[PDB]
């Protein structure tokens, strides 16, 4: 019997099995074929991790269906960054603010930030620069990796989707409580752990089932397929590691080209992104040093230019699991000093006691006087 396997590529390879062959045995067939340790392989059929004691026949593998092999080894923070070095992973990050004109830490904000939009959109937040000579009125927020001591120019991308799973929300795929998790921007705000997110991305990338949006690029919605949920910050795919992320970038460049009308050069090992004019059927792989191959092919048959004539996979998600995996489906607290109840309007954690005899400025989260640490770790709740 033949099963088509996809392992870190859209190029699927056939594998000879029997109906009574277990998933343990299929992992061994692949392990011997690729020369990788079998105890690191995950088998995915229609977005489901197959139990090893089950046989090929039990898994409803029918004929030439796609089985994915994915190789996997073994303080309060509102912000997470992708640290490119030396962490080479997602880390709790520190929010920092500066004046947009002089780029100094002299900007005094009107009110502090309450949501991601305030700190991600340029010139959204207003203030007053306290430098000797600077008429700066807008604020520039940046992030830094919190895991280690940082150089002022050593900034990191904020991965706004990642959250400390303080709430104990079960993951949509495996129904486990993990931390940190990814929170999709679908209405339900479905949560997936970073391990299931890895399986979701790597398999979808193998099937070329990532979505191309002209003004966004190459992305993926919520696992559950919720509308208007495409990951907007595409550096979130850095979570997959540099090899998978580079593969995602390549496939994205290829989709973009084909979505832009061009073609990819048909020659073996070329695959150059070429954009011919609407009425051109003779396409030459132009470019000197590269993308120089530099073959003149037909835009239609993809053979050497002549004068004459010439399995979409479903990612299975449990309805009960999607219901439990929702981020949002505690009004007033007393002031730490005077015990007068203070109400919280919006996301900002910087509280101001209204009581005239008090007027204490404290952190809603910690119950301590306002400070630069509370600002960097959790200026606003998420």
């Amino acid at each position: 019997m033949i099963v088509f396997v996809r392992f870190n590529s859209s190029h699927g390879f056939p594998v000879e099995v029997d109906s009574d062959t277990s998933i343990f045995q299929l992992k061994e067939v692949v392990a011997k074929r690729q020369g990788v340790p079998a105890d690191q392989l995950r088998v995915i059929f229609a977005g489901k991790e197959l139990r090893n004691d089950w046989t090929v026949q039990n898994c409803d593998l029918d004929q030439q269906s796609i089985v994915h092999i994915v190789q996997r080894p073994w303080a309060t923070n509102s912000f997470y960054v992708y640290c490119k070095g030396p962490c080479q992973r997602v880390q709790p990050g520190k929010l920092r603010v500066q004046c947009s004109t002089c780029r100094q830490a002299t900007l005094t904000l009107t009110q502090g930030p309450s949501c991601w939009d305030d700190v991600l959109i340029p010139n959204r937040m207003s203030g007053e620069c306290q430098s000797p000579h600077c008429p700066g009125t807008s604020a520039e927020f940046f992030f830094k990796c919190g895991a280690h001591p940082t150089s002022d120019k050593e900034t990191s991308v904020a991965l706004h989707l990642i959250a400390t799973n303080s709430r104990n929300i079960t993951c949509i795929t495996c129904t486990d409580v993990r931390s940190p998790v990814l929170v999709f921007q679908c209405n339900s705000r479905h949560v997936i752990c970073l391990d299931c997110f890895h399986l979701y991305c790597v398999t979808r990338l193998n099937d070329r089932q990532f979505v191309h949006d002209p003004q966004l690029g190459y992305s993926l919605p919520c696992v559950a397929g919720c509308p208007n949920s495409l990951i907007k910050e595409l550096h979130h795919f850095r979570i997959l590691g540099e090899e998978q992320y580079n593969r995602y970038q390549q496939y994205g460049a290829e989709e973009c080209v084909l979505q832009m009308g061009g073609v990819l050069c048909p020659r073996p090992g070329c695959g150059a992104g070429l954009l011919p004019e609407p009425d051109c059927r003779k396409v030459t792989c132009e470019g000197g040093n590269g993308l120089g191959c530099g073959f003149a092919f037909c835009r239609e048959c993809k053979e050497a230019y002549h004068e004459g004539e010439c399995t979409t996979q479903a990612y299975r998600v449990d309805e009960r699991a999607a219901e439990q995996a929702r981020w949002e489906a505690k009004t007033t607290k007393p002031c730490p000093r005077c015990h007068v109840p203070v109400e919280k309007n919006g996301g900002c954690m910087h509280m101001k006691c209204p009581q005239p005899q008090c007027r204490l400025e404290w952190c809603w989260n910690c119950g301590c006087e306002w400070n630069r640490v509370c600002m960097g770790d959790h200026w606003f709740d998420v």
Binding site: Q215, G217, N246, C256, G273, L275
Partner: protein
Amino acid sequence: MQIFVKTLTGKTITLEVEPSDTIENVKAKIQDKEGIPPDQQRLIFAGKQLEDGRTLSDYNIQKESTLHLVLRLRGX
């Protein structure tokens, strides 16, 4: 900062840029290195076509990130 400009052939150009540099400057820096006119050049990042007027900062392209070079040829 250094950035890489990769072609789908696998050709790689290393560029010394700054976050404030526009897509136009990147294209001009590519012309100085490989002699490809900017009108033929198309740059892509995470599947999005990068528009001339926008800077690298606007696309959050980090130190040592790669851009994809695709060609609009004339003849076609």
